[PDB]
Amino acid sequence: GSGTILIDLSPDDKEFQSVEEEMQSTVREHRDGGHAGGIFNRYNILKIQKVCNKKLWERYTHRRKEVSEENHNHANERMLFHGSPFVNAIIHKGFDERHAYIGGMFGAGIYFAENSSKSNQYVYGIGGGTGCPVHKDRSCYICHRQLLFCRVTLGKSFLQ
Amino acid sequence: MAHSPPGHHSVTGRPLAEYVIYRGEQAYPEYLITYQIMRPE
Ligand SMILES: CCOc1ccc(-c2nnc([C@H]3C[C@H](NC(=O)c4cccc5nccnc45)C3)n2-c2ccccc2F)nc1
Ligand SMILES: [Zn+2]
């Protein structure tokens, strides 16, 4: 089975508060006026869990080094938010580009954002899909959402 | 396709057999063959 352990972080833990602050402080007003991700200036942060998986970590650090050696010994590593309907799969199986939606404006890739409110727009699908499963509401205040705050190797990044 | 279908690592077609990989590290260029096509008699 999955070699993923979830480590529950305490609200009083500095690591919790750091990820919490990044989530809250990177909210912005969006051009679609909350159409995709809902209307809000703030989150209710219910849980922050460290995803521990040796297989997925060693896979990441291996590729990070390969990219590093290709880009003047610089990984160009960034902490970035990810939203998609497949967070439960990703924490167990890792990120899989074979499931990437080709219709995206930047092609068949996996999307990250430095704004939490941007990644929130993709939690229920492209353009917020049909919103939450229960109320079919993109701006649902009841249903619990999941984002990933990810270590991402950008290496030599191409501007579009 | 940009990548292998989900659960797959390659594509095989018959439009003769052709094999396609979407990652360069899934092949090693083991032998370099220098040659000419021979004019048939
Ligand atoms: C306007 C811009 O449009 C966009 C915006 C965002 C996206 C986008 N970025 N990443 C994804 C998901 C994550 C990946 N899948 C897995 O990593 C996966 C792993 C393991 C098991 C799985 N099982 C099923 C599916 N995926 C996995 C795709 N997306 C994304 C893709 C489809 C639908 C919604 C999304 F947010 N793409 C385009
Ligand atoms: Zn709901």
Author numbering:
A (entry chain BBB): 950 to 1109
B (entry chain B): 1115 to 1129, 1136 to 1161
What does the paper say about this structure?
Tankyrase 1 and tankyrase 2 (TNKS1/2) are members of the poly(ADP-ribose) polymerase (PARP) family of enzymes that regulate the turnover of specific target proteins through covalently linking the cellular redox metabolite NAD+ to target proteins in a process called poly-ADP-ribosylation (PARylation). In this function, TNKS1/2 also impact the WNT/β-catenin and Hippo signaling pathways that are involved in numerous human disease conditions including cancer. Hence, controlling the catalytic activity of tankyrase by pharmacological intervention provides an attractive tool for reducing WNT/β-catenin and Hippo signaling. Multiple potent TNKS1/2 inhibiting small molecules, including bicyclic lactams, compounds based on heteroalicyclic amide scaffolds, tricyclic fused ring systems and 1,2,4-triazole scaffolds, have been identified. These compounds block the catalytic domain of TNKS1/2, either by binding with high selectivity to the adenosine binding pocket (which differs from other members of the PARP family) or by binding to the more conserved nicotinamide pocket.
Based on our 1,2,4-triazole-based lead compound 1 (OM-1700), further structure–activity relationship analyses of East-, South- and West-single-point alterations and hybrids identified compound 24 (OM-153). Finally, the introduction of an East quinoxaline moiety instead of the naphthyridine group (compound 24) again led to picomolar cellular activity (IC50 = 0.63 nM), and we prepared further variations based on a quinoxaline core to interrogate this part of the pharmacophore. Next, we solved a co-crystal structure of TNKS2-24 demonstrating that 24 binds to the NAD+ cleft of the catalytic domain in a similar manner to the previously reported analogue 1(39). The observed electron density is clear for the compound except for an apparently mobile ethoxy group extending toward the nicotinamide site. The previously identified hydrogen bonds of the scaffold were once more observed between 24 and the Tyr1060 and Asp1045 backbones, as well as with a water molecule. The quinoxaline moiety is forming π–π stacking interactions with both His1048 and Phe1035 providing improved binding affinity compared with that of 1. From these compounds, we concluded that a gain in potency in our in vitro TNKS2 assay and cell-based WNT/β-catenin signaling assay cannot be attained with compounds possessing the East 2-pyridyl group while changing South/West groups, and we therefore focused on compounds with annulated aromatic heterocycles such as naphthyridines and quinoxalines46. Such variations enabled picomolar potencies as these moieties are able to form a significantly more efficient π–π-stacking interaction with His1048 and an additional hydrophobic interaction with Phe1035 as evidenced by the obtained co-crystal structures.
